[PDB]
Every structure is written in structure tokens, then in C-alpha cells.
């Protein structure tokens, strides 16, 4: 564009969902105060906002006994919330509060009708906005009668308070047509879904999903996630976790993860552990129900010390995503590659371009990159420098000849090249 975007905070990197304070922090400190103790960790992830809760009083399926202005005392006090907000802001981490009303029940929106419940949400937005929250999330919106109307209203209350706040909506739907109807009356909404979840599939299929979505939504700013709540490991085999991290951190828009995504936390790796809220594995003492079962490589502490870990990959990708202009706000052009491949470039003005090449298949593949329809200003050079691969054995920092590019099974590559030459 040759004129620099005034980006919102949520364009500048990943959002990180913490839906269970107890499970995330562990026994003894499943409260708002305890979360402050994890802000240095979250800061090391370079995440730009935390999506917290819900944390409000909610008697299961009891509209009268549900109050979105009151914190459930199990999670602490309003002062604790105030102090968390303040420490978070200090570390450049913004806070989004999830206000999904009947979050302890099965229908998040209650079965008894909507206006009294939607009024609860409305009154709560003004209250929490004055307390200084940077925004809100509401999930399961497919279950909200008149969702597009209520979302527009709630978005307008939020943006009316300040342009630097936002509303995120989550849905269980994987249907593009249903998803686009939700975004119809709602231009400024980030919406998470299962649209990409469906992809445990080929590179051509993932490519078509991504480009279908981008073309349907025009120039609006997207989110990229595999679900509105669930772990990546709910949907992807281990062999694909790295590839998807690379993809989500390089697609145009805001990536959204759930706590544990950065370590490949898998709810089914450990007996008895809610798919809902798996216990966050800080170290080998983090699962005391079966003492001895957690091994170092499943933990934050073990993964931090290993440059080869998922966590180390997540941190490097997050760093790139939050500092490089072509990743922050560059255009996206996908192009023709070989059979199991999905390849694209991110490019902003004359800033360093990024080429992403993703092999979704279980066979080694020649990339056979065919540009031809790329813009001239971003065309492919003969060689680009390898920034990283999801697998070992490459010389990072040295140039690869693009014509001879070959990928290992499931390997993702991140390459960069300058404007011109």
C-alpha cells in the first residue's frame, strides 16, 4: 500500500484462550491472583491478549441465579481482577473477558427465552468496559436466537466505548454458508469456528478452504483457529501440529490458540482429564492424580530447554508474527505447487517477504512452485533464505534454491527474501 496501517492491538499477534483457571494454573491457585503468576510465561509466548473465563456467577440453567456482573468467589474478587488487568497491561498483554452466560450448563444461552439473557450481556459490557477490559468473547452463538442482531448491538456498545476494544464470537459450526451469515450484519467481528477443523486433509483442500474464506470475506480482517475453544490436538494428529502452527502464524489475520497448544497439550494423553479443560503441564509434578505419569517432554519446563520442541517453535513463530510487517499486515497470495502442498507469500510494500511451503502429505515431495500469477513486485527469487523448518536437518539462515525445493513428509518451511533482487 505504501501507507502504514494504524493497526489495532489484536492485529499484532496471537490471542490465547484460558477457559479454565484451575486447570491452567493447577491445585491451590485456580483464581485470578494466581494467573498474575503466569503473566511472565505468557509474555514469553508474545501473545497479545488473553481470553479469560467465563468467571461469573452461573447457577447451572438458572437465569435468575446467573449474574454476569459478579465474579464467582472461587476465582477471587473484583480487586483481584483489577490487579490482574493492571499487571497484564504492564506486560503489553490485553484481557478479553468471556461472558457466555450459562457456561456451566449445556445450552450456553439458556432455553428460557433470550431478551432477559441478552440484557444480562448488554448490562455486563458497560460494567466491565468501565473496569478496563479490552474486550469480550461469547461462544456457541449458533445457539443464540437472533445472533447477528445481538452481536451487532454488543459490538457497537464495545466500539462506542473505545475503538481499541473488541468483540470475539465463537461458533461450533464448520459451515461457511452459516459462518458468512453470522458475519453479514457484523463487519468488525472476529469469529472463531470449526471451519478449518474439517481439515485433517490434503494441501489442496486446506488451500481451497483458506482461499474460499478469504475471497468470501473481502478485505476484512480474519481470525484463524481450528475451533472456538478446543485444543489443536482435538483435531490434528501429532505429525501435523507443527505444520498448523506455521500456517496459523503466517495466514493473514489474528491466530487464536487455547492454552496448551504451544506444548501440544493433548487431553487424551493422560487418563481422566476433561477434554473440556485439560490440566496444564508446567512440569512433571503438574499431574498429581497419577504421580509419575508426566514425562519432561510433555511439559513447559522440559520443552523450554529443548530448541527442537513445539514450545520453541511456537515462541519463534510468535516472535516473527508480531514483529515483521509482511506478517503483521502484508498481502497474501497462494500459488500452484505440487500434489500435497500448500504454498503462499506474505508481502507488505518493500518489506522482507515470507514464503511459506506446507507439505500436508505423508510422502516427501518436490515443491514444484509455479508462481506465474504472483504480482511482479513480490515475484519469486532464484533463492531465498531459510528462516526455519518444522523439522531438523536444514541449515537455517542459508539460501535454498527454490526450483530444487523438496519437502519431507509433513514438513513446513518458512523462507524469506527482500524486495527486488
Amino acid at each position: 500500500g505504501s501507507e502504514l496501517p494504524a493497526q489495532k492491538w489484536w492485529h499484532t499477534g496471537a490471542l490465547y484462550r484460558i477457559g479454565d483457571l484451575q486447570a491452567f494454573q493447577g491445585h491451590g491457585a485456580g483464581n485470578l491472583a494466581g494467573l498474575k503468576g503466569r503473566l511472565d510465561y505468557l509474555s514469553s509466548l508474545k501473545v497479545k491478549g488473553l481470553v479469560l473465563g467465563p468467571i461469573h456467577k452461573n447457577q447451572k440453567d438458572d437465569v435468575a441465579q446467573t449474574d454476569l456482573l459478579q465474579i464467582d468467589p472461587n476465582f477471587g474478587s473484583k480487586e483481584d481482577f483489577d490487579s490482574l488487568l493492571q499487571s497484564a497491561k504492564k506486560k503489553s498483554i490485553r484481557v478479553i473477558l468471556d461472558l457466555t452466560p450459562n457456561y456451566r450448563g449445556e445450552n450456553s444461552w439458556f432455553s428460557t427465552q433470550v431478551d432477559t439473557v441478552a440484557t444480562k450481556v448488554k448490562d455486563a459490557l458497560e460494567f466491565w468496559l468501565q473496569a478496563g477490559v479490552d474486550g469480550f468473547q461469547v461462544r456457541d452463538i449458533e445457539n443464540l436466537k437472533d445472533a447477528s442482531s445481538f452481536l451487532a448491538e454488543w459490538q457497537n456498545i464495545t466500539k462506542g466505548f473505545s475503538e481499541d476494544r473488541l468483540l470475539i464470537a465463537g461458533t461450533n459450526s464448520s459451515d461457511l454458508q452459516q459462518i458468512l451469515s453470522l458475519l453479514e450484519s457484523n463487519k468488525d467481528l472476529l469469529l472463531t469456528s470449526s471451519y478449518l477443523s474439517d481439515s485433517g486433509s490434503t494441501g489442496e483442500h486446506t488451500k481451497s478452504l483458506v482461499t474460499q474464506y478469504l475471497n468470501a470475506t473481502g478485505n476484512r480482517w480474519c481470525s484463524w483457529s481450528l475451533s472456538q475453544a478446543r485444543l489443536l490436538t482435538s483435531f490434528l494428529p501429532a505429525q501435523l501440529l507443527r505444520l498448523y502452527q506455521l500456517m496459523l502464524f503466517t495466514l493473514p489475520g489474528t491466530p487464536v490458540f487455547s492454552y496448551g497448544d504451544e506444548i501440544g497439550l493433548d487431553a487424551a494423553a493422560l487418563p481422566g482429564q476433561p477434554m473440556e479443560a485439560p490440566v496444564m503441564l508446567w512440569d512433571e509434578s503438574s499431574f498429581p492424580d497419577i504421580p509419575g505419569a508426566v514425562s519432561a517432554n510433555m511439559t513447559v519446563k522440559g520443552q523450554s530447554e529443548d530448541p527442537g520442541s513445539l514450545l520453541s517453535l511456537f515462541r519463534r513463530l510468535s516472535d516473527q508474527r508480531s514483529k515483521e510487517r509482511s506478517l503483521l499486515h502484508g498481502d497474501f497470495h497462494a500459488f500452484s505447487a505440487g500434489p500435497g502442498l500448500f504454498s503462499y507469500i506474505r508481502h507488505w510494500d518493500q518489506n522482507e517477504r515470507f514464503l511459506v511451503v506446507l507439505n500436508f502429505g505423508d510422502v516427501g515431495l518436490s515443491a514444484g512452485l509455479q508462481a506465474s500469477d504472483l504480482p511482479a513486485s513480490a515475484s519469486l527469487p532464484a533463492k531465498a533464505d531459510l528462516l526455519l523448518s518444522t523439522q531438523p536437518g536444514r541449515e537455517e539462515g542459508s539460501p535454498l534454491e527454490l526450483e530444487r525445493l523438496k519437502l519431507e513428509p509433513h514438513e513446513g518451511l518458512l523462507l524469506r527474501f527482500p524486495y527486488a533482487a
Side-chain angles (χ1 to χ4, degrees), residues 226-280:
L226 286 210
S227 61
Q228 69 169 348
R230 286 179 175 170
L231 287 168
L232 292 185
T233 51
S234 279
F235 310 107
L236 299 170
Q239 333 123 4
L240 286 178
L241 293 164
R242 292 176 174 257
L243 200 69
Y244 273 74
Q245 283 192 7
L246 175 50
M247 195 177 61
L248 300 170
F249 272 114
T250 61
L251 284 175
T254 297
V256 184
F257 292 106
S258 288
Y259 78 84
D261 279 345
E262 74 278 24
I263 58 166
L265 191 62
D266 181 343
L270 225 29
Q273 198 194 189
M275 9 83 212
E276 166 129 39
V279 177
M280 179 66 164

Side-chain angles (χ1 to χ4, degrees), residues 145-305:
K145 168 192 146 255
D146 218 347
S148 76
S149 303
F150 286 117
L151 293 173
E153 178 175 23
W154 303 336
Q155 186 76 260
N156 286 333
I157 287 163
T158 299
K159 298 293 184 162
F161 198 90
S162 159
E163 60 166 304
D164 295 308
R165 328 290 260 252
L166 92 168
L167 180 62
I168 300 177
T171 186
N172 293 295
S173 177
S174 49
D175 196 60
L176 186 59
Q177 302 306 291
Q178 204 200 163
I179 280 165
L180 304 171
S181 68
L182 270 21
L183 305 179
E184 162 62 344
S185 202
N186 288 273
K187 268 186 209 183
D188 230 316
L189 188 66
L190 288 197
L191 178 68
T192 56
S193 72
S194 303
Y195 179 65
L196 283 188
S197 148
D198 157 56
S199 77
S201 59
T202 64
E204 314 296 313
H205 188 244
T206 299
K207 179 179 171 184
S208 52
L209 291 176
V210 168
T211 58
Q212 279 198 68
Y213 191 74
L214 287 164
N215 297 1
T217 55
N219 296 301
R220 79 184 271 142
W221 181 276
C222 281
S223 67
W224 295 105
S225 59
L226 286 210
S227 61
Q228 69 169 348
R230 286 179 175 170
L231 287 168
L232 292 185
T233 51
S234 279
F235 310 107
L236 299 170
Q239 333 123 4
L240 286 178
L241 293 164
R242 292 176 174 257
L243 200 69
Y244 273 74
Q245 283 192 7
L246 175 50
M247 195 177 61
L248 300 170
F249 272 114
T250 61
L251 284 175
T254 297
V256 184
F257 292 106
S258 288
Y259 78 84
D261 279 345
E262 74 278 24
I263 58 166
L265 191 62
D266 181 343
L270 225 29
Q273 198 194 189
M275 9 83 212
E276 166 129 39
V279 177
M280 179 66 164
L281 305 176
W282 300 102
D283 61 40
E284 297 176 54
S285 78
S286 297
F287 204 80
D289 283 331
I290 313 164
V294 178
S295 57
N297 53 106
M298 299 169 64
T299 70
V300 171
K301 174 182 167 203
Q303 292 192 25
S304 301
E305 59 179 36

Side-chain angles (χ1 to χ4, degrees), residues 125-147:
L125 302 164
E126 327 209 285
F127 179 86
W128 293 113
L129 287 161
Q130 285 290 177
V133 307
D134 300 293
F136 303 96
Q137 175 175 269
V138 298
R139 278 185 270 170
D140 292 356
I141 52 155
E142 69 280 346
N143 292 130
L144 177 53
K145 168 192 146 255
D146 218 347

Side-chain angles (χ1 to χ4, degrees), residues 36 54 71 90 109 142 221 285 292 302 354:
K36 285 193 309 193
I71 295 170
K90 220 166 148 177
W109 293 99
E142 69 280 346
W221 181 276
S285 78
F354 294 86

